[PDB]
Structure formats: structure tokens, C-alpha cells
């Protein structure tokens, strides 16, 4: 093929193909080893539906609730986009929990794979942070009172207790400043950190391969 | 039905096997048998189930927030129930925060405490398996209790 | 009763999973029969 | 709120998955002792 030759003499794409076609799947791998991949699929669904809603949602105390109602009743297929975002968030967490059961009960965390387990724990904390921040964006009765309780928990820590509450709320009490900071975390900060740690998780798995039989 | 046997005469493969690696060198070819033909089956199934639940069980709208009126019942998302139960039942606030923070902290120590044993099968790991099963029951017990009055935390209204 | 409804749904999910696995082995049986004939 | 369908799915898949993992582990255990 002329097209293949044009690319091959410049970037040597044939080396990439050889790498892909040199891998094998050992016979002790079964259907339960799919759970890690299924967790990733749910995350990509969140990105697609989450980005679409940034074109209509407005993060202010005066407009937040009204803009969500507009999405549910006026936007073409808006009812479907929002409902998927809510259901797929729960499924991502459920599949991750089952992924942890597989790893522990096959002993896939032992030497030399200690660092893969460590980066896995960090991903678990980040996923839980997505849920808590998004829960309050609608600014309804349930969301508003949940955020009050959560942001007051660290007040019991001596010394660094009160200053931590100030950073989370952006003030002494819950209000507009709290909503602005939570929106920034949900759509900019957490997505960036998740991408970095996913890359580290996948690079090490590629380097070492899957663990051995039982 | 396509398989490739290990080449046990290769010095390089033998070295990796002694270190617990090299298990991607034998078995069924990855491309196209799995990556191209089987993975799309899984992806379609995952997306289809989520779409179906969204159509049949849509989301609610709710009511606007009111800072002068507390709702009668307030609950977080389901996967926060076990830590929520700890918060509402431990009188000492400082003790409650420490217990909550010990969940992620405890998990970090798992690989460094079980490296003495070098078996993978759970039936050759009697002590470790027992600890795991006890932890699973406790987490479910706390989670269900979060939806009941505090006076039923220990019994769940069964005995 | 909310509790009663939750229990019913949980039991159904267990049944669906087992049926799905079983139908998988039925397909493998059919493939073997055609292969030998 | 209490979500009936969501809670039912969570409590159904967790036990069946655990049972499947123990069954496969047991079969490999027996053949290794032969």
C-alpha cells in the first residue's frame, strides 16, 4: 500500500504493530478479570455526558436550581442525558468494589506489584470525591443540607481544625463561595488528577503483565 | 481453541518466571481474538444496561434549598452509609474522625503485612481469608443500620 | 413495605446471573455436536 | 432518599460475585494437590 509506505518510512509504525501482536492471554484468566475494564467504561460515559451539561448549567445560588429544571423539560433529550449521568455514577462505584474483591482473593497485590495496589487506593479516594462534590450542584434541599454536615466534620481536629473548614467553605458559613469552589473541583481539578493516576496504574500493568495462576 | 505452549528452554523466560512475571508469553493470542472481537461485546452490554435503567427510572427534580427548614430525614449516597453510621453513634467527635480516616489508611498497609506468606490461593491463606470475611460482614452491618433509629444500631431490630 | 421490595429484587439478580452462565454452556454443547457431525 | 431499585441491585450482585470467586479458587486448589 502506498499510504502504508508513506507513513512507514517516516515514523516506523511497524514497530508498534509488532508490539501489539506479541502478547498472549494465559489460560487461568477468566471472566472476573474483566471488572477493571468495565470500571473504565463507566468513567468515559461520565465524561461524555458531563461535558454536554456544561453547556446549560449555571453555578449560582440564584440560578442553579432553575437551570437543572430547564434541562429536564426543554432541551432535546435533556431528560436522557441527565438520567444517564446519575445512574452511571453509581455503577462506576459498584464495579470498582467488585474489582477489589478479585484482586485480593487472587493475591495479585503481592511482590513485585505493591505499587500497583498503592496507586489503586488513590483512585478509590478520588472517585469518592467526585460523588460528594456533584451531590450538591443542583442546590436542592437534600444537596444543601448534606454539604453542611460534610464540611463541618474536620472541625474536631486540634489546631488545623477551623482553618480547614474555612478553605472548604470559602467563608465561615455555607453560601455562594462554597458553590463556586465545589464546581471548580468537580469539573477541573478532580478530572486532571484522575487522568494522571490512571496513566500510572496502566503503565505498570503493561510493564509487568498479569499475575500468575492459583 | 488456539493456544501456544511455553518455551521452557528459553533462558530469558525462565528468569522472568522466577520473579513472578512473564505470564503474557503463552496462551491465546491477544490480537484479534480478544481485543478486536470480545471487548466490543462487553462495551455494548455495559452501555445498554445503563441506558435502559435511565429510561424506565428517570431522575426527580426535588425542592429548592431552604436555610431555615431542616428536612425530616436526610441521607447521603449509599456507599457512604458505613462511615455515616460511625459519625452518628460515637459520642467522642475526635475518636469518630480517627476511625473514619483509618479505612483508607488501613488498606495501604495490606501488601506490606501479608508479604511473609508467598501463596496466592485463598485456601492456602487461612488467617488472611478469615480477616477479610469478618470485615465484609461488619461493613454491611453498619450500612444497613444507617437507615434505622440509633437505638437499633446493634440489633437491627431482629433480637 | 420498602424492605420487602428490596429483598425481592436482590433474589431476582441472583437468578439472572446463574441462568446466563448456564445458557453459555448450552451453546458450547451445540457447537461440539455440529463439529463431530 | 431510599431508592428501591438501586439498593436491590447492589445487594444482589455482591454475594453472587463472591460465591463465584471462591468456586474457581477451590477447583484450582484440588488439581494442584494431585
Amino acid at each position: 500500500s502506498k499510504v502504508y509506505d508513506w507513513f512507514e518510512e517516516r515514523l516506523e509504525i511497524q514497530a508498534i504493530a509488532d508490539d501489539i501482536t506479541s502478547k498472549y492471554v494465559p489460560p487461568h484468566v477468566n471472566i472476573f478479570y474483566c471488572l477493571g475494564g468495565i470500571t473504565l467504561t463507566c468513567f468515559l460515559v461520565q465524561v461524555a455526558t458531563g461535558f454536554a451539561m456544561t453547556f446549560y448549567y449555571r453555578p449560582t445560588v440564584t440560578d442553579a436550581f432553575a437551570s437543572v429544571q430547564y434541562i429536564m423539560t426543554e432541551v432535546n433529550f435533556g431528560w436522557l442525558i441527565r438520567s444517564v449521568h446519575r445512574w452511571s455514577a453509581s455503577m462506576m462505584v459498584l464495579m470498582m468494589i467488585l474489582h477489589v474483591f478479585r484482586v485480593y482473593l487472587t493475591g495479585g497485590f503481592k511482590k513485585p506489584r505493591e505499587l500497583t495496589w498503592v496507586t489503586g487506593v488513590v483512585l478509590g479516594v478520588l472517585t469518592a470525591s467526585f460523588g460528594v462534590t456533584g451531590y450538591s450542584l443542583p442546590w436542592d434541599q437534600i444537596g444543601y443540607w448534606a454539604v453542611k454536615i460534610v464540611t463541618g466534620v474536620p472541625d474536631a481536629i486540634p489546631v488545623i481544625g477551623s482553618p480547614l473548614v474555612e478553605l472548604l467553605r470559602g467563608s465561615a458559613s455555607v453560601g455562594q463561595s462554597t458553590l463556586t469552589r465545589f464546581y471548580s473541583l468537580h469539573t477541573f481539578v478532580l478530572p486532571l488528577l484522575t487522568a494522571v493516576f490512571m496513566l500510572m496504574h496502566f503503565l505498570m500493568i503493561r510493564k509487568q503483565g498479569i499475575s500468575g495462576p492459583l | 481453541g488456539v493456544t501456544k505452549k511455553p518455551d521452557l528452554n528459553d533462558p530469558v523466560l525462565r528468569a522472568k518466571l522466577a520473579k513472578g512475571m512473564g505470564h503474557n508469553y503463552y496462551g491465546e493470542p491477544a490480537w484479534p481474538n480478544d481485543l478486536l472481537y470480545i471487548f466490543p461485546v462487553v462495551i455494548l452490554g455495559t452501555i445498554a444496561c445503563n441506558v435502559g435503567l435511565a429510561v424506565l427510572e428517570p431522575s426527580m427534580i426535588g425542592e429548592p434549598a431552604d436555610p431555615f427548614a431542616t428536612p425530616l430525614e436526610i441521607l447521603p449516597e449509599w456507599y457512604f452509609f458505613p462511615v455515616f453510621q460511625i459519625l452518628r453513634t460515637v459520642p467522642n467527635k475526635l475518636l469518630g474522625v480517627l476511625l473514619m480516616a483509618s479505612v483508607p489508611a488501613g488498606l495501604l498497609t495490606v501488601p506490606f503485612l501479608e508479604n511473609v506468606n508467598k501463596f496466592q490461593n485463598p485456601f492456602r491463606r487461612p488467617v488472611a481469608t478469615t480477616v477479610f470475611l469478618v470485615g465484609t460482614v461488619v461493613a454491611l452491618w453498619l450500612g444497613i443500620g444507617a437507615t434505622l433509629p440509633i437505638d437499633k444500631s446493634l440489633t437491627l431490630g431482629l433480637f | 413495605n420498602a424492605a420487602a421490595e428490596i429483598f425481592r429484587i436482590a433474589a431476582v439478580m441472583n437468578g439472572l446471573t446463574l441462568v446466563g452462565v448456564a445458557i453459555g454452556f448450552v451453546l458450547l454443547r451445540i457447537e461440539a455436536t455440529v463439529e463431530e457431525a | 432518599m431510599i431508592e428501591v431499585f438501586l439498593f436491590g441491585i447492589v445487594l444482589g450482585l455482591i454475594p453472587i460475585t463472591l460465591a463465584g470467586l471462591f468456586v474457581t479458587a477451590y477447583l484450582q486448589y484440588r488439581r494442584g494437590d494431585q
Partner: peptide, 26 residues
């Protein structure tokens, strides 16, 4: 007996290693 054996093979593949084998164990 053949039917039972047929089912057992499908659940777990019979052409795999085991962690007690000297090659992997050593």
C-alpha cells in the same frame, strides 16, 4: 461421569500451570 467431567473442564481450563509447580515455585 463423562457429563460431570465435561462441565468441570469448561469451568476451569485444564492446560494451565499451578503455583506449586517447581518451575514457578523455584
Amino acid at each position: 461421569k463423562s457429563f460431570v467431567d465435561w462441565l468441570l473442564g469448561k469451568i476451569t481450563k485444564e492446560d494451565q500451570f499451578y503455583e506449586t509447580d517447581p518451575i514457578l515455585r523455584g
